[PDB]
Design a protein around this ligand. Structure first.
Ligand SMILES: [Ca+2]
Length: 240
């Protein structure tokens, strides 16, 4: 997250860190949202590589002991069957991970609230992106969880020519684009939390930013629209 601020420890208890094993260590690669004690929602592009992955819940600082983390292996990776890695702009960038163990819920580990199916946010709706992603274009990951205020940009505007044009689909949510704050690599897969009727819900799964860079004016961060995928998510969870 470029232009973010450090999140409070208990603000976003559905945020997870998806990590892969590299030698004898583990490296954060993406975010996700805990949606059941034993399921995580993330981006399909986060699990394109044939890696060994674990999920960390209750994580705050990637480089130091918080006294709150639970570490759990990934038992099953269900990618959306229309996902194509060579075409992020086609959408379907979503995947569900079944965890090898159910995690324990507490202040730091909670299920993410998801929007009702079909819900679309008005233009300029208040949202925060969260993650440990790069803090600058071509920069480095944050040690502590960051958040950035990223108001949505409606589809009519987002899919216009000076924004993302036809690159953006109605199955996506755009947010930010102020040239200062944005998601960035390593935020992928994580939540966009938006305020609706008093309640934050996870309306987005972070998908992509411009090839030009992370915080680019009129290139808002793009997210998979969670409310387009409710039936899909239920169907998976019901049959795995
Ligand atoms: Ca930690």
């Amino acid at each position: 997250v470029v232009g973010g601020t450090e999140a409070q420890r208990n603000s976003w208890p559905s945020q997870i860190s998806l990590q892969y094993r590299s030698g004898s260590s583990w490296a954060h690669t993406c975010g996700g949202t805990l949606i059941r004690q034993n399921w995580v929602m993330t981006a399909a592009h986060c699990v394109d590589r044939e890696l060994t992955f674990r999920v960390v819940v209750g994580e705050h600082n990637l480089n130091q002991n918080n006294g709150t983390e639970q570490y759990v292996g990934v038992q099953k990776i269900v990618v959306h069957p229309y996902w194509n890695t060579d075409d992020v702009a086609a959408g379907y960038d979503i995947a569900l991970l079944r965890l090898a163990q159910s995690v324990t819920l507490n202040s730091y580990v909670q299920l993410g609230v998801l929007p009702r199916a079909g819900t679309i946010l008005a233009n300029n709706s208040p949202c925060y992106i969260t993650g440990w992603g790069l803090t600058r274009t071509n920069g480095q990951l944050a040690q502590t969880l960051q958040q950035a205020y990223l108001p949505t940009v409606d589809y009519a505007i987002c899919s216009s020519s000076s924004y993302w044009g036809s690159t953006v689909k109605n199955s996506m949510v755009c947010a930010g684009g102020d040239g200062v704050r944005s998601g960035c690599q390593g935020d992928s897969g994580g939540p966009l939390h938006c305020l609706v009727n008093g309640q934050y819900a996870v309306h987005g799964v972070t998908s992509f930013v411009s090839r030009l860079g992370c915080n680019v004016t009129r290139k808002p961060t793009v997210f998979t629209r969670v409310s387009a995928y409710i039936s899909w998510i239920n169907n998976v969870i019901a049959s795995n």
